[PDB]
């Protein structure tokens, strides 16, 4: 079902300059925010503290605060150590969290990327380089794997704290999590590349949660030339998708954009091409190009 992600973006320009911004996602809803200039992690939901007590949370925050500055300096040193092997600028990405399951079952992970390539994970008890990782990493890993304190803290964040803290969120956010926002669909078109051909675009916007079916139709028959675009975010935590079909000019009459979604009950959104509403909405859209 759900996946918890703590996301860390660390950027090092030279010896003097660096910053670490973090974001936190349960499923596809952002739960936390940690800007470099803030000393404290900020909730982005009312229910962000999950089920943890004020001091339970503080324990966690204070641990993370220490980690941040500690990690910064540690990287800086790792550079000093890899004297010509690697050099600023350096970009580091962390992805750490949980996969939740039925149970009281749960799987945990901590992945590190370096310059945008996945290189190092944590696994069981130690740090490990992954297949295809640059072989010069072998040393720093050894140097870091000597720190049994860091290892035991990480083991606790991954094995216990994470699956605990997120079960906490799943309750505290249940309402927000399972919410239905109804999609809102509108047709348009542009001229296709090919002469005497048109491209018809069916806009779907404002839906939640993510699964959505969008197809162009001639009656019951699904038009196979339908191309779904990528899921694009709205800022109000809803989604936008568009499906474009390509056809000969004049072939549009009788075509319809069928939408299926969990928010709609059994009632599929069917937009026929030259509909009473298409005609009118398109009129509200005219522009000078």
């Amino acid at each position, epitope marked *: 079902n759900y996946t918890f992600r703590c996301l860390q973006m660390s950027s090092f320009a030279n010896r003097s300059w660096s910053r670490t911004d973090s974001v936190v996602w349960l499923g596809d809803l952002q739960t936390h925010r940690w800007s470099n200039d803030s000393a404290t992690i900020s909730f982005t939901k009312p229910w962000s503290q999950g089920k943890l007590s004020n001091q339970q949370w503080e324990k966690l925050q204070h641990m993370f605060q*220490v980690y941040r500055v*500690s990690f910064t*300096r*540690d990287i800086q*040193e*790792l550079v*000093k*150590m890899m*004297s010509p092997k690697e050099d600023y600028p350096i970009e580091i990405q962390l992805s750490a969290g949980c996969e939740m399951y039925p149970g009281n079952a749960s799987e945990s992970f901590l992945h590190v990327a370096f310059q945008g390539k996945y290189v190092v994970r944590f696994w069981g008890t130690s740090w490990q380089t992954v297949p295809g990782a640059p072989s010069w990493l072998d040393l720093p890993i*050894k*140097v*870091l794997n*000597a*720190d*049994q*304190g*860091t290892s035991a803290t990480v083991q606790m964040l991954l094995n216990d704290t994470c699956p605990l803290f997120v079960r906490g969120l799943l309750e505290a956010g249940k309402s927000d999590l399972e919410k239905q926002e109804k999609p809102v669909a509108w047709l348009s078109s542009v001229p296709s590349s090919a002469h005497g051909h048109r491209q018809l675009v069916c806009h779907v916007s404002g839906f939640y949660p993510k699964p959505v079916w969008v197809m162009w139709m001639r009656g019951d028959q699904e038009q196979q030339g339908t191309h779904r675009g990528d899921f694009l975010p709205n800022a109000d935590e809803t989604w936008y998708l568009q499906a474009t079909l390509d056809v000969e000019a004049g072939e549009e009459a009788g075509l319809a954009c069928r939408v299926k979604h969990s928010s709609l009950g059994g009632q599929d959104i069917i937009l026929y091409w030259g509909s009473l509403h298409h005609i009118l909405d398109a009129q509200k859209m005219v522009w000078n190009h």
Partner: T-cell receptor, first 113, second 114 residues
Framework: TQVEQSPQSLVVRQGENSVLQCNYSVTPDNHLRWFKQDTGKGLVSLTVLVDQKDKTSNGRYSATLDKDAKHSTLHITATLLDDTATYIC?????????????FGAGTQLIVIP | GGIITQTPKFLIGQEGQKLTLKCQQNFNHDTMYWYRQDSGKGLRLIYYSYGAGSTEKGDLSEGYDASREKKSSFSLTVTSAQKNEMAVFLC????????????FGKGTRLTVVE
């Protein structure tokens, strides 16, 4: 600094037990360790403490550390005339070789016959 | 199993003179340090290193430079000796896989005559 040792000078009778104190603020506090320095010489390692509440003992020396309290004590049992050299509390801030050492200003011991 | 040694034990220097002090180590230690002991202050790092010819500034690097010719060896240079200067210079080496594995030498005592 971030490591305060007390008192600045101790005086004890030979054969007596002497107690040396060290408080800190260094963070994280991976480990604390004690050093003996004879006049005009190097730093000799006495004992190394790691755990949240740790006790270690080498030879005469016995040392305890409370992390919660950010405090450490060094005991010398049956002090001898040798024990004259100054004593240095040092906190390390990483369990990796990346981490370094934060030095206390030291305590002179003066063993009277 | 072996020793870390600083030469010379004692050193006579004059105002504004350039001063060097070697430190050798056969522990196979990759990290090597140069501290300064000031009466009533405790050790302050001047220069460290992770091997030849890595040299990295510590909190007291101003007024000195250092050079690591080889694993076994680490030299510090005092650029301009102070007028009445008196200081002890201590050298330490360390394992990269054991934060703790740090061993010190027997110190170097500098007197600036005048």
């Amino acid at each position: 600094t971030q490591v305060e040792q007390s008192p600045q000078s101790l005086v004890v009778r030979q054969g007596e037990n002497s107690v040396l104190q060290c408080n800190y603020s260094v963070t994280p506090d991976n480990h604390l360790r004690w050093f003996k320095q004879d006049t005009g010489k190097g730093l000799v390692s006495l004992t190394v403490l790691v755990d949240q509440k740790d006790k270690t003992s080498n030879g005469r020396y016995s040392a305890t550390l409370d992390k919660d309290a950010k405090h450490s004590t060094l005991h010398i049992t049956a002090t001898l005339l040798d024990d004259t050299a100054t004593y240095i509390c040092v906190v390390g801030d990483r369990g990796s070789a990346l981490g370094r050492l934060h030095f206390g200003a030291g305590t002179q011991l003066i063993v009277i016959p | 199993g072996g020793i870390i040694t600083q030469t010379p034990k004692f050193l006579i220097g004059q105002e504004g003179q350039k001063l060097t002090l070697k430190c050798q180590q056969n522990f196979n230690h990759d990290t090597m340090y140069w501290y300064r002991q000031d009466s009533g202050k405790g050790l302050r790092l001047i220069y460290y290193s992770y091997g030849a010819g890595s040299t990295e500034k510590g909190d007291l690097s101003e007024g000195y430079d250092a050079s690591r010719e080889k694993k076994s060896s680490f030299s510090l240079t005092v650029t301009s000796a102070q007028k009445n200067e008196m200081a002890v210079f201590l050298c330490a080496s360390g394992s990269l896989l054991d934060v703790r594995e740090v061993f010190f030498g027997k110190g170097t005592r500098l007197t600036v005559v005048e």
